[PDB]
Amino acid sequence: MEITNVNEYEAIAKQKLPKMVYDYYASGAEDQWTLAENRNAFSRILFRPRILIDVTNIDMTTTILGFKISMPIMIAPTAMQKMAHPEGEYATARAASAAGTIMTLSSWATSSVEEVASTGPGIRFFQLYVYKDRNVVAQLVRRAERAGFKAIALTVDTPRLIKNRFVLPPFLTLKNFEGIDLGLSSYVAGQIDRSLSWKDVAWLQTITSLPILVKGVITAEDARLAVQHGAAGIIVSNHGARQLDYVPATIMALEEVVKAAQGRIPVFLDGGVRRGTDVFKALALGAAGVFIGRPVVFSLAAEGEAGVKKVLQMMRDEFELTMALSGCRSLKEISRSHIAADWD
Amino acid sequence: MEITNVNEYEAIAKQKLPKMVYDYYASGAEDQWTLAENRNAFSRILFRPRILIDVTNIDMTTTILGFKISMPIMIAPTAMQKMAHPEGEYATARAASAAGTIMTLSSWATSSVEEVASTGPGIRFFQLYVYKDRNVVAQLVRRAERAGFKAIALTVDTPRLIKNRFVLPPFLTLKNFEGIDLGLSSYVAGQIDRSLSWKDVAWLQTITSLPILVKGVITAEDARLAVQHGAAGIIVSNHGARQLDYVPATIMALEEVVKAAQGRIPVFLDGGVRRGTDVFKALALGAAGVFIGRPVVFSLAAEGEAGVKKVLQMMRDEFELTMALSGCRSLKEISRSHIAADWD
Amino acid sequence: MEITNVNEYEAIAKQKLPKMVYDYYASGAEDQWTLAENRNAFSRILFRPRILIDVTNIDMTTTILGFKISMPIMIAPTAMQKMAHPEGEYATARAASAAGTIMTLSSWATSSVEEVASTGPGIRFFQLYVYKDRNVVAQLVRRAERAGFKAIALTVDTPRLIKNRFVLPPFLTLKNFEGIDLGLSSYVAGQIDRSLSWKDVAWLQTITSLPILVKGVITAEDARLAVQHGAAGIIVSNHGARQLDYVPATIMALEEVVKAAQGRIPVFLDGGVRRGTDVFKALALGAAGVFIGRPVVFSLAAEGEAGVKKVLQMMRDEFELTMALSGCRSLKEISRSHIAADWD
Amino acid sequence: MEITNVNEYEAIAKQKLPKMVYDYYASGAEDQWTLAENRNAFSRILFRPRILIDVTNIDMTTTILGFKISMPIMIAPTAMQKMAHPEGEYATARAASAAGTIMTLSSWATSSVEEVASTGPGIRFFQLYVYKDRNVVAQLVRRAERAGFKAIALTVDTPRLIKNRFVLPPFLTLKNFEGIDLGLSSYVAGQIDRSLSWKDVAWLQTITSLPILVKGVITAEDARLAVQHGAAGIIVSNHGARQLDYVPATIMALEEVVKAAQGRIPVFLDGGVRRGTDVFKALALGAAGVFIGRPVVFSLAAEGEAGVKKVLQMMRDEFELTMALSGCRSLKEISRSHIAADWD
Ligand SMILES: Cc1cc2nc3c(=O)[nH]c(=O)nc-3n(C[C@@H](O)[C@H](O)[C@@H](O)COP(=O)(O)O)c2cc1C
Numbered sequence A, B, C, D: 001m002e003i004t005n006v007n008e009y010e011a012i013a014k015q016k017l018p019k020m021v022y023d024y025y026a027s028g029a030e031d032q033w034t035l036a037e038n039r040n041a042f043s044r045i046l047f048r049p050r051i052l053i054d055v056t057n058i059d060m061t062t063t064i065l066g067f068k069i070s071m072p073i074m075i076a077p078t079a080m081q082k083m084a085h086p087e088g089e090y091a092t093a094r095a096a097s098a099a100g101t102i103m104t105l106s107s108w109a110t111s112s113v114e115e116v117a118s119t120g121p122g123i124r125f126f127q128l129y130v131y132k133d134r135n136v137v138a139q140l141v142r143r144a145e146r147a148g149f150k151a152i153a154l155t156v157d158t159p160r161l162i163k164n165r166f167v168l169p170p171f172l173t174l175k176n177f178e179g180i181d182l183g184l185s186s187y188v189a190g191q192i193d194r195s196l197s198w199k200d201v202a203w204l205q206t207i208t209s210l211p212i213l214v215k216g217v218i219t220a221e222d223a224r225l226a227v228q229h230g231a232a233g234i235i236v237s238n239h240g241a242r243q244l245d246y247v248p249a250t251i252m253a254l255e256e257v258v259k260a261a262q263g264r265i266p267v268f269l270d271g272g273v274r275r276g277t278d279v280f281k282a283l284a285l286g287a288a289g290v291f292i293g294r295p296v297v298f299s300l301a302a303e304g305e306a307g308v309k310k311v312l313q314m315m316r317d318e319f320e321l322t323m324a325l326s327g328c329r330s331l332k333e334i335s336r337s338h339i340a341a342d343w344d
């Protein structure tokens, strides 16, 4: 009946969404071992609270890529949001701007960069999927710059491969591809370029001046390469545990990637973040911020824009209370010594 | 039917107390992970008994802050005991004096320092909650000194935030605040000063000469600060796992805090102590004594003063037998090598 | 109904095979602790995928003992296959040749080396069980060379000791012993020579020029002896967990044996391999290839030659996808750093 | 119906024995955590079998305190065996002599040293419980020497404290105390001397020349003291997990005690030994032999002398097979490297 926390939206969404759709949303890869881990691993990290600290004034605002935001909790890119709620990306963009945070727009969105940008003022990032036809990629990137998007998140952990048993609602299209020259179900399928390599990151930088974030890094080895090749940030991710099963939980991999980057570029994380305590734990391990994926689609399905705003609020309030109880007045005061990781 | 051990009082109390009251007593924070840990962790520590030792005469008396007591098991402060049994703090004070041990009186007690002190001779400590109005704090402290209390336990792990669904029995008031100039349900709520810091420990020492114990320390870092700021003792505590979930069990945190204090001041522990074996394990890890919270309210609800005395006796007899079986004739002979901690 | 993966053949085989036969096939030793481990241990090893790698062209062909094969997945020797399907070894030999891989022929086969060799062109290994009468051993070895077998796998982890309650189908005989001069149920029983030692490996090399692989090694100590005595390869095996219970899973023992061999001879593994991910993990740990036992008999019982070919295909496709997702284009690119073992 | 292994006798004994008696036999202390551990810990130790070893001739005979016996498996002292079977100690003595092994006679036996010695030739040890009246102790020791007992096992882990609800069968008495000058239920109770110390071990050596084994050692510290005070052997024991709960499993404590003794005196073990694999594991860890307690009373209750002989045989055959499968032809060849302990 009443939603006291983020995970509850999942039950409500499950009630109102067709089984096929809910299963598609919640699903991980294969055995779904990592899906569970992305969540479970946060509970193997304990707090080491500090006492006798004046926690009367808590400040959780931060600067991401130069942009000042209200909290280190942002929205990850989840494709075709209008399938969860007719408002779709419009609802999400408005909730994000209202909350004073960042929203990342998927390439497979049901609303174009300009439709989203029309909703109003707000900092947004554009998620890029590189197609074989570079011509289409260039068109998408310039279009994002024009629409006012602040950075490009290049997804590199794209899962491979229901579809034949489902029929999409009418008029739902991949709007970002409407206008640029290339059912819509297919075609876009074998369009993802699996030959993508670091040289392509170099090329991307020649067509745009926007910061390029590499989304899908879980090893210290690739983190170094990200820095060496000029990426502006790294997003420790395993695509919500939908790409390959038995890879570690992103929160387990975070520290090694943060270490490897050596403070050169900000490291972000997604995968399993549901509570304010999870946010604190990620920041204590070195992350500059976190992205949430699934909670966004579940709350959108549940209460639309109101649901998305509630998720962000609940997470903010929980994160604020966690800081007060741990003895932290600002993000700068959250230290690695404020938690005791499973390997500590 | 028959109570052979402390944990059984819980079942009996659960039978006779209103659900809301029992749940409030037994409850931990959030998932209650730490609530369980405070208990479970004691079972991950094994004994390493010594043989061929004359265990004919066992001595468990000790000196706490100069005061000689019969056993290293004392009573922690639990608010408004008259709600568990009409006798409340009177019963507790009398059982404690009879057992030759120490009782800590809560600030939120249903009996004033002088009501408790009227019960008779006995060593008692007063637990202080610092309100924003320092004037009230000073009044409470002087009043405790006058009533003969031997030390002040400053609680620093005070949980934040049923209340709207419960009605209190008639005449039950926070007696310690009756007379000093400041329903009673509210007001006292937003009175706790969350700006409390070490400078406030320094100030406390200017208004009283009584030993100040810092209650709510679980890190080596704050333990050092306790010593550096003149605290007379440290109580490793997590407020019965009611402040923040996912902090370690106090028995897991004990050794690091004992190490950090470097023998300068005595370190005590509360949270999950129910058996004589638990007491032994805490002492072997360096604690100078332990405090019990919940068992006190459960037995009080069950058999009143008789229940509280029985708890103390059962714990004493179990602790005595554990010493005899481990090869220890005095507390001084209980060594770190007498147990094998989970990390050993 | 539909077989999407190898383990499913087991359910189908279980449905159509007599209980005694299925139980005999699936069974491990004693408590069957190792039987489970051979499988479970593969799940305690995580992947560490690399991104931005051109995985457009995957190559999994390899060279085993000089012979070029299509994939590092081969067939282990399982006795009397005609009991699982009338085609028996004929089906298996044909599926193996078709798949471009190697098949190892059991000494207790229901088809002779020449019957198997008659099926067509293909690389096959012959598994040798050393009988007390060396005369019979020599006869078997020369016969295998003549029939075109490429190497001898000397089994050394032969289990000791249903038989009295089962009756075999008519005409099923140990064909390899038909013709050479020595019911058939017995006799062959107490024929296995338990005095077999390294000196016997030296003797074997005097009667044949074929590579001798030592099958049944799980310690670094015996691996060294294998190399020192001239074995051409080692097969880390525990006889499908049927010899002795509580020995480690072969995947747990692999690395130590690979280390000990110091790259002198190839190390192979069998026991619990069912998925393409298992293959990858074994190769990352140093194995030059893997053998599958039980899946062969289960699929043979299920769909005969078609079942065996399907198993090999499913494993190939899963292995190929695992390489693409991990960032590996050839077997040479699969590194120890591509996984995170339970002890890492 | 049929007993294939030792643990099965327990079910049969449970069927025919009164509940109170069976519960008394099987019971551990308190939570019975250690009772389970004594058994469970053996399963956390893996085998590391060696191959290509001539295991045609296995030899498990050994020399204990100069006496040559057929196997390293002996009988621990369990009080009043006639309560399990009318034959009691007579059955046990005869089965032990027949098996060519050693039997330890309890002080609380229902048959005297001379009754047991009358059964025939066999090596037996006498278990001593030291009473406060040294006069009685001296009488018992000389009587044991006279009866031909080869060593004294001084029990030091004697549990403290059903009795009031049970009535003993007629004529069952503590025969060893019949004749020496001191219902029989009581008296013997508060007769155990809890002031027993190492000086008492020194005194024991002045009244007898028989080897003194110290029974009840689980720490390296007391093992050293055993050696320093002239004990002839150590028995790593926790009294079948009946003295104090949460002490480690004897198999977990064995290695540290073996190390500490530095090969000066033989170390033996009891507690949880049920299988031939358990025996091997104990020997690999350094024990010179093992004692079995409970299996003796359970099989005695089940089939009397025939049951006891069967237990010893089953254990012998299992132990022999374990040696053959591990590559060991003599006890001298069983090495620490033949197993992989949980901490390895
Ligand atoms: C249904 C669904 C759709 C997704 N669509 C995209 C997408 O369009 N683009 C992208 O890069 N990632 C996509 N992701 C994954 C990421 O946005 C992100 O890593 C996220 O799901 C993180 O995990 P969480 O869902 O546990 O928060 C999708 C994930 C899900 C669950």
Ligand SMILES: Cc1cc2nc3c(=O)[nH]c(=O)nc-3n(C[C@@H](O)[C@H](O)[C@@H](O)COP(=O)(O)O)c2cc1C
Binding pocket: B024, B025, B026, B038, B076, B077, B078, B079, B080, B106, B107, B108, B127, B155, B215, B237, B238, B239, B240, B241, B270, B271, B272, B273, B291, B292, B293, B294, B295
């Ligand atoms: C119902 C209840 C009331 C409590 N009231 C107080 C209080 O008045 N003052 C204080 O400092 N702590 C209070 N505590 C906590 C401590 O006294 C103490 O840390 C204790 O509960 C330790 O854990 P145990 O209950 O497991 O023994 C309370 C705890 C409970 C369970």
Ligand SMILES: Cc1cc2nc3c(=O)[nH]c(=O)nc-3n(C[C@@H](O)[C@H](O)[C@@H](O)COP(=O)(O)O)c2cc1C
Binding pocket: C024, C025, C026, C038, C076, C077, C078, C079, C080, C106, C107, C108, C127, C155, C215, C237, C238, C239, C240, C241, C270, C271, C272, C273, C291, C292, C293, C294, C295
């Ligand atoms: C029913 C059955 C029969 C077997 N027969 C033989 C055999 O004839 N020769 C041999 O060396 N090993 C034999 N093995 C064992 C090996 O081929 C091999 O190690 C294998 O079973 C590996 O494990 P997996 O079954 O988990 O793949 C047999 C195993 C089973 C399950």
Ligand SMILES: Cc1cc2nc3c(=O)[nH]c(=O)nc-3n(C[C@@H](O)[C@H](O)[C@@H](O)COP(=O)(O)O)c2cc1C
Binding pocket: D024, D025, D026, D038, D076, D077, D078, D079, D080, D106, D107, D108, D127, D155, D215, D237, D238, D239, D240, D241, D270, D271, D272, D273, D291, D292, D293, D294, D295
């Ligand atoms: C019912 C019972 C009676 C026992 N009586 C004695 C006894 O008379 N003397 C002694 O030293 N120990 C006695 N023990 C314990 C030892 O003999 C011995 O340590 C043994 O039980 C070892 O464990 P197991 O029973 O798991 O083999 C007794 C144990 C049991 C179970």
Ligand SMILES: CCCCCCCCCCC1=C(O)C(=O)NC1=O
Binding pocket: A020, A021, A024, A079, A080, A108, A159, A162, A163, A166, A239, A242
């Ligand atoms: C049964 C519902 C129909 C499926 C809806 C089509 C969604 C298109 C794929 C979106 C997407 C994912 O699901 C993902 O993990 N990444 C993506 O880039």
Ligand SMILES: CCCCCCCCCCC1=C(O)C(=O)NC1=O
Binding pocket: B020, B021, B024, B079, B080, B108, B159, B162, B163, B166, B239, B242
């Ligand atoms: C439903 C029963 C009504 C609740 C009774 C009011 C008790 C007041 C709070 C006492 C208190 C706690 O409960 C605690 O953890 N610390 C405290 O200082």
Ligand SMILES: CCCCCCCCCCC1=C(O)C(=O)NC1=O
Binding pocket: C020, C021, C024, C079, C080, C108, C159, C162, C163, C166, C239, C242
């Ligand atoms: C109940 C079915 C009858 C049993 C069939 C006889 C198979 C002969 C043994 C084959 C064999 C095994 O089973 C094994 O682990 N190794 C072998 O070398």
Ligand SMILES: CCCCCCCCCCC1=C(O)C(=O)NC1=O
Binding pocket: D020, D021, D024, D079, D080, D108, D159, D162, D163, D166, D239, D242
């Ligand atoms: C309910 C059955 C009655 C009990 C029988 C009396 C046995 C006397 C105690 C024997 C004994 C034990 O049980 C033990 O652990 N050590 C001993 O020395």
